[PDB]
Amino acid sequence: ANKGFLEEVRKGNLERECLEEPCSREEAFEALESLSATDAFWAKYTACESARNPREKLNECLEGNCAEGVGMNYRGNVSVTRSGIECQLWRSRYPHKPEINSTTHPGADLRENFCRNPDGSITGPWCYTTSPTLRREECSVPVCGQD
Numbered sequence: 813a814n815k816g817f818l819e820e821v822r823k824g825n826l827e828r829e830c831l832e833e834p835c836s837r838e839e840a841f842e843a844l845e846s847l848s849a850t851d852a853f854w855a856k857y858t859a860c861e862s863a864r865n866p867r868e869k870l871n872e873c874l875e876g877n878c879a880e881g882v883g884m885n886y887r888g889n890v891s892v893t894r895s896g897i898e899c900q901l902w903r904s905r906y907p908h909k910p911e912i913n914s915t916t917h918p919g920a921d922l923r924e925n926f927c928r929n930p931d932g933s934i935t936g937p938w939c940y941t942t943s944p945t946l947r948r949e950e951c952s953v954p955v956c957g958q959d
């Protein structure tokens with residue numbers, strides 16, 4: 813956050829500016845070393861916008877081993893759909909040619925074939941499936957703070 817005085821004279825610091833305080837994308841950018849690090853952090857930050865307090869809750873949301881809300885923050889390793897179909901690699905163009913990818917959604921961490929929710933689908937983290945007849949399907953990932 814910018815407490816309009818001389819704070820913007822200091823080197824950016826993610827802990828001070830974006831974790832202990834809410835921040836704008838540009839503040840995150842100023843605190844990071846690349847656009848790549850900035851797109852990833854921003855996607856995580858906005859996906860956890862409402863899991864801001866306490867800090868332990870925010871850190872769990874940002875780590876992403878569980879889904880918060882619709883799971884846009886999810887960064888775990890589940891790679892199978894809820895019906896048990898093995899996920900297709902995001903980078904593969906077979907058996908489905910992805911219309912969502914690294915370029916369209918930078919920051920979403922579309923890696924290997926891990927379930928992700930880059931588009932905010934209301935049914936949660938999903939993946940393109942290796943079944944030729946089922947383009948995509950959601951996955952089963954723990955909800956943050958569940959049981």
Ligand SMILES: *[C@@H]1O[C@H](CO)[C@@H](O[C@@H]2O[C@H](CO)[C@@H](O)[C@H](O)[C@H]2NC(C)=O)[C@H](O)[C@H]1NC(C)=O
Nearest residue numbers: 876877887888889890891921923924925926927
């Ligand atoms: C989740 O998946 C990631 C990515 O494959 C695993 O981390 C990688 O593990 C390999 C082998 O241990 C390393 O060569 C890579 O450097 C790791 N990638 C990184 C650092 O992102 C990770 O171990 C997996 N964790 C779980 C929950 O199984």
Ligand SMILES: *[C@@H]1O[C@H](CO)[C@@H](O)[C@H](O)[C@H]1NC(C)=O
Nearest residue numbers: 903910911912913914915916
């Ligand atoms: C993502 O999809 C676009 C649109 O089809 C395509 O032009 C581009 O090459 C793809 N990029 C990646 C990251 O594969």
Ligand SMILES: [Ca+2]
Nearest residue numbers: 813814815819
């Ligand atoms: Ca500040």
Ligand SMILES: [Ca+2]
Nearest residue numbers: 813814829839
């Ligand atoms: Ca600031």
Ligand SMILES: [Ca+2]
Nearest residue numbers: 820824839842
């Ligand atoms: Ca700054």
Ligand SMILES: [Ca+2]
Nearest residue numbers: 827828831832
């Ligand atoms: Ca701190």
Ligand SMILES: [Ca+2]
Nearest residue numbers: 828829832833
């Ligand atoms: Ca402060």
Ligand SMILES: [Ca+2]
Nearest residue numbers: 820838839842
């Ligand atoms: Ca600034």
Ligand SMILES: [Ca+2]
Nearest residue numbers: 838839841842
């Ligand atoms: Ca700037």
